[PDB]
Design a binder for this molecule. Sequence first.
Ligand SMILES: Cc1cc2nc3c(=O)[nH]c(=O)nc-3n(C[C@H](O)[C@H](O)[C@H](O)COP(=O)(O)OP(=O)(O)OC[C@H]3O[C@@H](n4cnc5c(N)ncnc54)[C@H](O)[C@@H]3O)c2cc1C
Ligand SMILES: Cc1cc2nc3c(=O)[nH]c(=O)nc-3n(C[C@H](O)[C@H](O)[C@H](O)COP(=O)(O)OP(=O)(O)OC[C@H]3O[C@@H](n4cnc5c(N)ncnc54)[C@H](O)[C@@H]3O)c2cc1C
Lengths: 457, 461
Amino acid sequence: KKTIVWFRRDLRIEDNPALAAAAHEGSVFPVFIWCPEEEGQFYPGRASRWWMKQSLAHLSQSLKALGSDLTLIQTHNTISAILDCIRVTGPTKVVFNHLYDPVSLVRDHTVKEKLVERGISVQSYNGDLLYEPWEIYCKPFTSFNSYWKKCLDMSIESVMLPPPWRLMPIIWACSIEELGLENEAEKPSNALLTRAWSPGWSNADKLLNEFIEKQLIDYAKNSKKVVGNSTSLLSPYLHFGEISVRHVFQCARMKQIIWARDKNSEGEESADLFLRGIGLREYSRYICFNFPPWDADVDKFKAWRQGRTGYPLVDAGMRELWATGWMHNRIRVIVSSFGVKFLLLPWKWGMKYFWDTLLDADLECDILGWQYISGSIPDGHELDRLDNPALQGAKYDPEGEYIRQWLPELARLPTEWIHHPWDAPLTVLKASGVELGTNYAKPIVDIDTARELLAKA
Amino acid sequence: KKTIVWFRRDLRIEDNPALAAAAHEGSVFPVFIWCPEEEGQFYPGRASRWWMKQSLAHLSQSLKALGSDLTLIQTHNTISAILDCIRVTGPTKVVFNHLYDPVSLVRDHTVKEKLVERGISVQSYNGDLLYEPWEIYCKPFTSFNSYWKKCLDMSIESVMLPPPWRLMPIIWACSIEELGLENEAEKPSNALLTRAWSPGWSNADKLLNEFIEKQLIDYAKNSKKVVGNSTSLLSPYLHFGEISVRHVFQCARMKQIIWARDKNSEGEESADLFLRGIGLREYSRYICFNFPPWDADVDKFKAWRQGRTGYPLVDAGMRELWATGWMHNRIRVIVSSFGVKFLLLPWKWGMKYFWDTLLDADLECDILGWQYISGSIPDGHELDRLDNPALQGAKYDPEGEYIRQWLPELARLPTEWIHHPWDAPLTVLKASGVELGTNYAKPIVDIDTARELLAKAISRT
Ligand SMILES: Cc1cc2nc3c(=O)[nH]c(=O)nc-3n(C[C@H](O)[C@H](O)[C@H](O)COP(=O)(O)OP(=O)(O)OC[C@H]3O[C@@H](n4cnc5c(N)ncnc54)[C@H](O)[C@@H]3O)c2cc1C
Ligand SMILES: Cc1cc2nc3c(=O)[nH]c(=O)nc-3n(C[C@H](O)[C@H](O)[C@H](O)COP(=O)(O)OP(=O)(O)OC[C@H]3O[C@@H](n4cnc5c(N)ncnc54)[C@H](O)[C@@H]3O)c2cc1C
């Protein structure tokens, strides 16, 4: 009759089973408990912490519009802090939504154990997945398409809950600044991100609406350019659960149904392709549940993260990542595949840098991504294949516009050579304003010698 | 495992509990059973039937795209038809969504009582109401003000069901034409409604999105304007259940929450007024379920339904109704109140005529509007007040554009007189090109006469 609602990475009021459950069985005490030393090695990066702060404030003022507050707590032990919430609130139950990362797994367990030890009941809900990673079983599911063909033959009839109509409310609590989510010196450079992004669940709704109604129809061809923000841009919102992925899946399947009826074959395959992405976020939770000779050269690492490799697609991507906190999925493949296969940087460096600059930085997806670009996951591009920037150029940036947007020094380079300038003839380079080594970098390593120092093993 | 899904007035594949449940349990056999003889006094009107015919086709091709089909049967006895489906399909259960009109209540009870006897499973579901008429109680209310917020103080939160994944398929069968929903002579006149209206659940969806995203914000003021189609225009879709009132309600409350938190005061006001509309529809079913000289004149009636009364708000209203199958709510008040308090026609004559020309013709909403007009209900229009056309016009058509659009012969009448031309000085009527009795009808009843008869009716209670 008096429940605590533990928010973690489900910062929304719509289709939130935990909050819904608690709101219906009675009064609720919503809380967010930050415990850095317990996240340890999985402490969220700089950009992810900045987004978190924004949408925590967004979610908090939403809850007061409904009649409750958001209590924030920063502490050294999570159960310690939880128990005092029970002390001051006299509640009987604690609810939360499952996360699947290693840290929350041990903790959600350790907090279920210690809590029912004292007669207070705990019940967690699935707030982030169409299918929990233990519900779809066997030959193996070592693939993604075996996995995704299985779920699409299993019903997806799980239903979606409205936001609670009202919330009846009920210390070492603190404010949002007091959580320490930003560092003082990085604050103004962080604020610049608001010019590309407005976190919070109400914005998540607005974004999903315009995407489904206007952009989804073109997803299958827009999503192959890397220029512009050609895909949905939902990933940060999905990571913080500011939008229920069930809502995302169902809105998209409504279109697929209508487009299938009305024999609009392009919209059909658009909806097919886009839902595959949603399934990849699923498989990410699936594999991370069931399957728990480096050049340690910091200068090389610095050239990589600053975009001075001489590889335009790479340099552009790193510039976009630094400026916006986001990059198209194929740019993620290109730059990471560049960090390890071309520069032979240790992957912990590259992954740690994605961790600290990606707004959608997400343990399971980011893991699955690095495992793809290194031939680890059985369905990932083998390591010996070192693909040609020119060919990458023709398929994802066929008019050179991505380069010309992020690397304006190269604006007068003809498209035939804008993705591999070291191969153009010299009169072509002088005709463009391009002096390799002076105003754009020389290829930091030549593609051909990197080709065969990689075949070494 | 093998289930008959009986469609009646729920022509949609989303948030459709009977459809969702059956598909979850196994194979399904959707049917629509048309039996005019059982409908009786309540046979649907010409415009409703035209809409139903479009919608059924829309539904039929949807369910095919999903892997099943919609079978259409026209019969003399519904109970019969259902049994022969069963005998052929060999299924073990039948499901449907509740309806609340007195034909449906008796037919539903009779159908359930006879399938039960033959060992057939039957389950019915709430697919048209936020709350069913037996879930709100104190004894019953009779004032909407207290019914609605007795609702709002309660758990106004119901789950939304996704459309079925896929439908696994399995007589007197016939096509939509052979249902006979149109009369051959009326078909071209009917086909002109596609002018203005696109029936079907997916069109309902498109329209709802457009309303919440771009229109709802302004509804509080737009709902003041009888000209244009300034409200949402969801009513036909709601009446046929092509869109779920639960969906509709949730989308509006979502915006209401955004605007209340962001302290957009204009949008808050629109949202609660719009939900008041949904509450009114809800109240219609609560009232009819729980609560089951004045001289006629065949020629006054014809002048009324043809729009030759000399009351421009009334005549424009009937022009618009006949041309589009729809009219703003306050025009509905004005012409029905005119039918009743000015012409003293039998109130059923007015309801039957709405019943034949409203596309959204709805038994419970229509009963509710005519009863608020005849002041049968407590917070209804007290039988004493008399319309003042000039004030009506000032409020709902403050610039005369409703009249000038539907009654163009009055275009050059100045706004301060366009709603009550019998009051303008002769000189002003001639400056406009307006000759009452020639150009535009004299008021078929003098308003002072109506007032004087009303006043003698009141000094006898
Ligand atoms: C090295 C590498 C690292 C990556 N790190 C992350 C990360 O930290 N956080 C993150 O959310 N995604 C990550 N991805 C996946 C992908 O690049 C992004 O999800 C996508 O670009 C985000 O933009 P979007 O919302 O417009 O994608 P859309 O094409 O519009 O897809 C819609 C949603 O479906 C999911 N999705 C789509 N593609 C994938 C995919 N390949 N893998 C997993 N989920 C997918 C995402 O939640 C995405 O938001 C990584 C990929 C690679 C190769
Ligand atoms: C004499 C009279 C007869 C009427 N006959 C019908 C009818 O046959 N079928 C019908 O659906 N409505 C009827 N109404 C109610 C109202 O006029 C219409 O529902 C409304 O004009 C339809 O257009 P809309 O959807 O754009 O209104 P909106 O303001 O956009 O309302 C949204 C929904 O709320 C419901 N609603 C709104 N207002 C009312 C109301 N006063 N009473 C009941 N429900 C309401 C309707 O389902 C409507 O579709 C009648 C009203 C009167 C006074």
